[PDB]
Amino acid sequence: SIFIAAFTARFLAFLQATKAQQYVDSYVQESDLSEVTLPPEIQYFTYARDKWLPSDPQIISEGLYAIAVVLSFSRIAYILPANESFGPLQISL
Amino acid sequence: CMEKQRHDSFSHSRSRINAYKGLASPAYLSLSSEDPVLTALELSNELAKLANIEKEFKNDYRKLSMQCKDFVVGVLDLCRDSEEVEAILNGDSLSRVKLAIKYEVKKFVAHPNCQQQLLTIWYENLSGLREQTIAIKCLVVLVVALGLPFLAIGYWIAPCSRLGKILRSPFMKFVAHAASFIIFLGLLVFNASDRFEGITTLPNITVTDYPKQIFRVKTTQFTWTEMLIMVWVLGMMWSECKELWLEGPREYILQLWNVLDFGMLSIFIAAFTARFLAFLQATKAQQYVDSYVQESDLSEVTLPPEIQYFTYARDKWLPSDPQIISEGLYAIAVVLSFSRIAYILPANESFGPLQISLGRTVKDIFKFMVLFIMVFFAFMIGMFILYSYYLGAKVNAAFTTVEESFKTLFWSIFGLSEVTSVVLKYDHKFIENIGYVLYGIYNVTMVVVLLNMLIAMINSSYDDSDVEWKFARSKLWLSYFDKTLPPPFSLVPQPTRYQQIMKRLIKRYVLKAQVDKEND
Amino acid sequence: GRTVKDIFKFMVLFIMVFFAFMIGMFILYSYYLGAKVNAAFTTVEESFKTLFWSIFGLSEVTSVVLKYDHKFIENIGYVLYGIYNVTMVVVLLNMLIAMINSSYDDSDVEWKFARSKLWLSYFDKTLPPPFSLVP
Amino acid sequence: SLSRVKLAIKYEVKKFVAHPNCQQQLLTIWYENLSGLREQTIAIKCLVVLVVALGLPFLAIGYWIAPCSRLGKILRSPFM
């Protein structure tokens, strides 16, 4: 479920990003985006890592993804009891 | 066997176990064949191998192997003359003792009747030194360490002399090897003298004896004690390669301690090879300077850069300079060379059992360290994936890379890493709080795994602790019974009488068993 | 008292391992006296000092890092320091286990024997040391 | 089918299931259709794990054609 949550948050961030990209490509015409001044709700998606809103969906995605990776490494418990030397150690643990 | 295996394989295995339980019986062992002690030893080895192979009836085969070992020890116990002890310890040289050491029969070798014979072989040609205190024997070690060159040259004339017999005794062989290793450690230490209180000149400064010479020639030249270390390592490597050629690579690699010894000697060889390459480059630069340029002092001259590089001080030095590799490998080799005390400690009465217990705990520590590695890699990858994007953002570059993440997570085991590792300069609280939580979970998990390791070792801890040490010491003795000079100086170039004794012993065993059975 | 009598042997083993690693780290870092950020392993005194205080976690991990851009020596310092810490932990655990095993009304009779020795020492020393000078 | 073994696992009867007479049967069911691989060392079995990890896409597509093949039986064994 935490993997699902991380990927859902990443997908929401991607949807917002591609909506901003669609707005930029649709309404404004120029050579480089940097010279242009954009509406702020759309311009926010041009900001770097530091500016990013604390509750950005991609921050949630990164955090949940790290937790999910740490937990996914725990699945070795389904595999260890088959071994002759690591089984009893897992039982005692 | 294939036909019996096709149908009722379980019954086939059960029949094999029944046949072996019949063969491993003391009754059939004693009354079956001539020389039943060898039969029982061989059957013990066979049953141990089949216990390792089957792995379902492992306990049955181990019980039968213990039966065979107990029969051998019981037959040995009944000896009440020196002739019978000698007859059991070697068949019609200590043959049965070697064969019981090979088959791991610990109570046969740690039995007083066997230990007394091994002790009279050990302290041969020097009877008085058996009863001296530990202080006097250690003092003898020191005396041999101080006088070993002289005794080395005297051993050439020794075979006629009585002192040659005194030196040829196994105890003096062991004392000579121990004093030799002591001299080796003393050389390793004394080579690092004149730096005990610190280097005198800063690494920025270059000091040379005469102006024309290159500074690297001064830095990489072989001092006398270093050449002595080189010939020493060559001698040890010769001995080890000789035993490798004899026993063969397959059997040689099996013992892990022999692999450690080979690696230590190889690392010494690597350090000296790198030092020699640096010295060759330095002397080539010196030869260029002396050949092509003419001046009073080298400092005033401007040289080609490839040759001039060898005039640089410590700081300028290329990161992959061969002498840096030499220093690193030499430090590792010294640290590993100090570990050779394991070849010497089992002879002692007070330090032997401690070494045995330490070895056992290490054998369990390996498995618990494997679990440590699994958990540690889990958390390392988690923290790296979390904090890698914030390289410039973090106040302390702790989890920004996989190297730094491994570093800080390892040093967190010993509490030597700060808690300010996870805090961010940026105003993101979700990532920083998840870092807090993951770091805390990691610390708690490491503590739990350590506690589980300690408990498992305590439970696995339980006169077997005495017989294991006596077995290790007896292996140490037999290694010297039949290696005369230390590595540095080893470079220079009517049934039968036995059938009567065995019949008497087996009669005693059968009678004792029948009396013990009827009495109960 | 019994635990101390075993602690002596395990401290002898401690001393062997500690001297091994002390000489190793000294031979490694002695050439970098001005180079190291912290003069930890530059001399045998400082090396003994930092390796002893590492047992109690009171010595920093910035001991082994260099100011100079040599990574081989600094990484070997990292590895040797980590191996030393792990080895000290293993020897401590082995000491604890050996003492636990050696721990087993004998504990009562040993104390009563010690107390009876204390008593017989006073059965037949009348005045304390300060006032036992007067004759 | 191992009915009593399943029912003893459900009722937590540990010595019935850990008995050699039961373990031998569970082992002959476990290493089914591959008899030789029972005695190989741990290194070789772990190497088999690595081989399967490298070749799993191909064996996945081959399992569709496998039920007729003998390799399908090799793959259908519980150990594989």
Ligand SMILES: CC(C)CCC[C@@H](C)[C@H]1CC[C@H]2[C@@H]3CC=C4C[C@@H](OC(=O)CCC(=O)O)CC[C@]4(C)[C@H]3CC[C@]12C
């Ligand atoms: C059995 C399976 C289907 C369980 C899967 C559960 C998820 C479908 C739910 C449970 C928790 C939910 C998440 C809780 C936290 C967030 C934070 C949220 O971040 C914001 O939208 C705030 C910023 C903004 O205004 O956009 C994004 C949705 C997300 C991932 C939610 C998406 C839907 C999630 C992943």
Ligand SMILES: CC(C)CCC[C@@H](C)[C@H]1CC[C@H]2[C@@H]3CC=C4C[C@@H](OC(=O)CCC(=O)O)CC[C@]4(C)[C@H]3CC[C@]12C
């Ligand atoms: C590279 C390391 C330090 C990071 C952690 C790796 C582990 C997350 C994984 C990678 C490979 C896995 C191993 C792959 C091989 C096996 C097979 C399996 O053991 C057996 O084959 C049992 C033998 C039998 O079947 O009778 C389970 C343990 C083990 C070691 C696995 C344990 C978990 C391991 C070590």
Ligand SMILES: CC(C)CCC[C@@H](C)[C@H]1CC[C@H]2[C@@H]3CC=C4C[C@@H](OC(=O)CCC(=O)O)CC[C@]4(C)[C@H]3CC[C@]12C
């Ligand atoms: C059984 C015995 C013979 C084993 C001995 C092995 C050595 C002969 C081999 C194994 C590893 C080798 C070493 C691996 C690392 C290096 C680094 C290398 O450094 C460089 O040359 C890089 C800088 C430069 O360009 O010169 C010097 C050679 C050396 C010591 C190699 C020399 C030959 C070594 C010591």
Ligand SMILES: CC(C)CCC[C@@H](C)[C@H]1CC[C@H]2[C@@H]3CC=C4C[C@@H](OC(=O)CCC(=O)O)CC[C@]4(C)[C@H]3CC[C@]12C
């Ligand atoms: C100065 C110290 C703190 C640094 C480490 C020294 C050790 C690396 C070496 C130096 C002298 C060695 C000792 C020299 C004397 C012996 C002889 C030997 O013990 C016996 O003689 C056994 C008695 C017997 O033969 O029955 C092995 C242990 C011991 C203490 C050696 C153990 C290893 C020692 C202590």
Ligand SMILES: [Zn+2]
């Ligand atoms: Zn046959």
